[PDB]
Design a protein around this nucleic acid. Structure first.
Ligand code: ATP
Ligand code: ATP
Ligand code: MN
Ligand code: MN
Ligand code: MN
Ligand code: MN
Ligand code: ZN
Ligand code: ZN
Lengths: 340, 356
DNA sequence: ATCTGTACATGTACAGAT
DNA sequence: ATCTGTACATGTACAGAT
DNA sequence: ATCTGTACATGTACAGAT
DNA sequence: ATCTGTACATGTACAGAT
């Protein structure tokens, strides 16, 4: 009852989706065309849409869109950075940039910013660079505000790096044939010290969000609806509302929630453990899983098992205890935060 | 248990598989390479292994392989032959290495098959390290069949096929009803794969005889056989074993044994049995209706179903709903009744034909 | 010199063998 | 249970062609 | 190489039926 | 309340034309 009503509030409106999408598509098409057909270092960059809007787990409003501009590279040589699992040096047009990530991002960002100056028909600016973040972020102002993250990424077509050998443990859930095929796809590197890139599996996570049942018919027109995505949306909402209220939660992001629920989906593969009539206890067992991650300070990258997203190197113990207390409070009081 | 022991007799032996597959691949690789030579009209033909051996339902011995030599054919327009749903005339838009077989835009199937056969016969002649010959042509067969004496006898059907990448012919819009079983995403992807036309090659005396092609979906059936569960992990190393393929084997065997004994059953073929079970798998989508512990009553329900198809004279092509493989036009009532009595007899007497 | 159809190289599900 | 041969999907090398 | 056309997936929206 | 059926909307894969 309660959680149904929250999900109705979170649902995007069809009209709001139509307006944001056609503005976003205008800017993205024009930027993609400024690459390639202008003999840049990024000729041949191809588009791939990623993230919550395209996985259909976006909540509240269509106000944030993620796009990769992926660029195939002749067979590069990778070297793992100091055993971090997820970060790598890259070695061997592009000779203008060891393939320095910051050097290549800056030219990328220099092109985007120039093309945005010549957009006289949409209110669109380029957000001040956030260091380390791999994105070039656009603030579009429809009558409403929309973020777009243009993520530069190298596409490599060989075996996945060995730090992922034990990753993606879908064998008992989506199965071995799905896993083998997923791992036959390319992998991607995005910018993160100034020469380091980071692995990306946004394409693999997109497939999983839209192929998320042990049953091939899960959530199709001739199958049964499950509540996996609704739990992702609810857990996403709880963290969004808590990040607004508390600056102490600045080090948490939605990817932390995404990763935890990939683990829950793997720990509980059956589609009937995610029946829509059991939406409450499903969401509760996700809260308890997420609190177990905080207490043990352990949340492994789903594709890179040794990379702990909750290591003290990245998040202070106090931040996790703070979030642990705030989540425990919303849990034991009917989620008052969902009504504001 | 009794059915468990039949499957062990039906189980292929890896030693036999190894020697059969070594010879068969040597011959096919050499025929395929010959097709790419000179001004051969079949340049660019590609190989696609189909049928029971590659679905892992081949029984008793590895002694019959099917392989498709498919040739992609671009601007192609199709005329359904007399509302049959499965048979087509193939016409060409622009007036081409295949022009040698045209007859005013209409592409002759038996002209193409003859040139295919002649080339195959010639390459078989120059194979000196293997005892292989080319079977006398069989009417209604799209295939050029090789007999190998590897000491043991081995049949190989080289099937000539046209490959069209366009959307499937509308006679199939209602076919492949896998929405409640393998689902709609699977169905949409499957129907984005090409479709194939093989020569009908009948000598019936009917009009358009040598210019009639038949639709083929061996490629879609290979996928289904090897991805047969509602659950993605069905029969995988971290999932539950089902008995779907084991039922198909037991039924294939019932028909093979009876066909071996009774000339009356010449009109029947293993595809009837494959088709019947695709309907049974659609009817019973859940993996739990194909539990290994209920192999007996699973095999029994597929029998009851096959009997109803023989008696009511209705077994729809899985992909072309309006094509009835058991119409009276194709098989006599007398032939269907005879098989119905024989299946009944085995069913209610402990299957004594398994012990032969 | 580069290009490219052909064939080797790699990895793993499937199921037979032990 | 683990070891293992065949089939097949996709990446990559390179002899011969340009 | 680039771009449109097509089909049907994933959604939202709502009335009528349960 | 939910379930079913139809309208409406965008996203995505790829054939075929240029
Ligand atoms: N720390 C990270 N490590 C790896 N991939 C990440 C990380 N952060 C983001 N991504 C990838 O980028 C995508 C876009 O991330 P973003 O921050 O927009 O969140 P999201 O999943 O799209 O959801 P939302 O925007 O609604 O919070 C993610 O879905 C994920 O694939
Ligand atoms: N009458 C038919 N109509 C349509 N497709 C057919 C027909 N006969 C055969 N096929 C196709 O050709 C394939 C090869 O036929 P074949 O007679 O070898 O049987 P099979 O399914 O391979 O089994 P087995 O040879 O072990 O009896 C079949 O799997 C099917 O895809
Ligand atoms: Mn997003
Ligand atoms: Mn983002
Ligand atoms: Mn066969
Ligand atoms: Mn055959
Ligand atoms: Zn679902
Ligand atoms: Zn199975």
């Amino acid at each position: 009852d309660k959680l149904k009503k929250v999900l109705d509030k979170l649902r995007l409106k069809r009209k709001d989706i139509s307006e944001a999408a056609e503005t976003v598509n205008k800017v993205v098409e024009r930027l993609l065309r400024r690459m390639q057909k202008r003999e840049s270092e990024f000729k041949g960059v191809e588009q791939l849409n990623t993230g919550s809007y395209y996985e259909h787990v976006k909540i509240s409003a269509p106000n944030e869109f993620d796009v990769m501009f992926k660029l195939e590279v002749p067979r590069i040589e990778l070297q793992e950075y100091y055993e971090t699992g997820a970060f790598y040096l890259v070695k061997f047009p592009l000779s203008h940039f060891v393939l320095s990530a910051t050097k290549m991002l800056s030219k990328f960002r220099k092109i985007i910013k120039e093309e945005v100056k010549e957009i006289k028909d949409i209110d669109v600016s380029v957000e001040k660079e956030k260091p380390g973040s791999p994105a070039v972020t656009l603030l579009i102002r429809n009558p409403e505000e929309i973020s777009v993250d243009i993520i530069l990424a190298l596409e490599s077509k060989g075996s996945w790096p060995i730090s992922t050998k034990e990753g993606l443990p879908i064998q008992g859930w989506l199965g071995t044939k799905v896993r083998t095929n997923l791992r036959r796809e390319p992998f991607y590197l995005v910018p993160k010290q100034g020469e380091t890139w980071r692995l990306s599996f946004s394409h693999t996570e997109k497939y999983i969000l839209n192929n998320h049942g042990i049953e091939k018919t899960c959530c199709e027109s001739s199958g049964a609806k499950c509540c996996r995505k609704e739990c992702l949306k609810l857990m996403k909402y709880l963290l969004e509302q808590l990040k607004k209220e508390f600056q102490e939660l600045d080090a948490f992001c939605s990817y932390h929630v995404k990763t935890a629920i990939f683990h829950m989906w793997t720990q509980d593969p059956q589609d009937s453990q995610w029946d829509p009539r059991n939406l409450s206890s499903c969401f509760d067992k996700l809260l308890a899983f997420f609190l177990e991650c905080l207490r043990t300070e352990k949340l492994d990258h789903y594709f890179i098992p040794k990379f702990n997203l909750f290591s003290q190197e990245l998040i202070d113990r106090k931040s996790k205890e703070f979030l642990s207390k705030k989540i425990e409070y919303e849990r034991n009081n009917g989620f008052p935060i969902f009504d504001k």
